[PDB]
């Protein structure tokens, strides 16, 4: 999956909701849940471009009214190879 | 790809128009023609998400004025593994 979808939320409950929605909506792989600090959890998915578009939309919708909310939802269709080095490859 | 696009029409002629259109328009494979009963024929395509969207749009545009009409054009991007058991694998 070339594309990247990312949702940042304030708190983990909103992020889990986002991840769930994203993975259900389209065919995407959750490659990371990242605890940023300060209460930011970023959930990241990879899939083909149309999938990541639908997943992100879905996740965003899901997460907005759960908890403290959504900080950001972003789709990056091809990411520079350099960026790949800072992107999680499987969740841990 | 695993997306599903389904077009239901009233009668078979609209549905063949839809199938034709879908398959020509985007890179999607036709997986079924189902006679639902009551004159509802469902034509189903599987492809990647962008392809499915495009195909279904094209097909609906094609079949709306053909025969008795279009009943539904719908895209489900990732289908639960269970629903797959009720979806035709190849067109037989």
């Amino acid at each position: 999956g070339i594309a990247l979808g990312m949702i940042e939320t304030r708190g983990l409950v909103p992020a889990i909701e986002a991840a769930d929605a994203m993975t259900k909506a389209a065919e995407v792989r959750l490659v990371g849940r990242q605890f940023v600090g300060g209460g930011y959890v970023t959930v990241l998915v990879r899939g083909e471009t149309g999938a990541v578009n639908a997943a992100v939309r879905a996740g965003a919708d899901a997460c907005e009214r759960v908890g403290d909310g959504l900080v950001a939802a972003h789709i990056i269709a091809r990411v520079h190879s350099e960026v790949e080095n800072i992107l999680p490859k499987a969740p841990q | 790809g695993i997306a599903l696009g389904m077009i239901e029409t009233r009668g078979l002629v609209p549905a063949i128009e839809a199938a034709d259109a879908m398959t020509k328009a985007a890179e999607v494979r036709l997986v079924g023609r189902q006679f639902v009963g009551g004159g509802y024929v469902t034509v189903l395509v599987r492809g990647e998400t962008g392809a499915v969207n495009a195909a279904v749009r094209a097909g609906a545009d094609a079949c709306e004025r053909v025969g008795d009409g279009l009943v539904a054009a719908h895209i489900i991007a990732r289908v639960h593994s269970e629903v797959e058991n009720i979806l035709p694998k190849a067109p037989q």
């Binding site: 909506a25 578009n53 639908a54 879905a58 | 719908h74 895209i75 991007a77």
Partner: peptide, 7 residues
């Protein structure tokens, strides 16, 4: 089902 709908 789209991202948007969802004689």
């Amino acid at each position: 089902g789209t991202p948007e709908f969802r004689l």
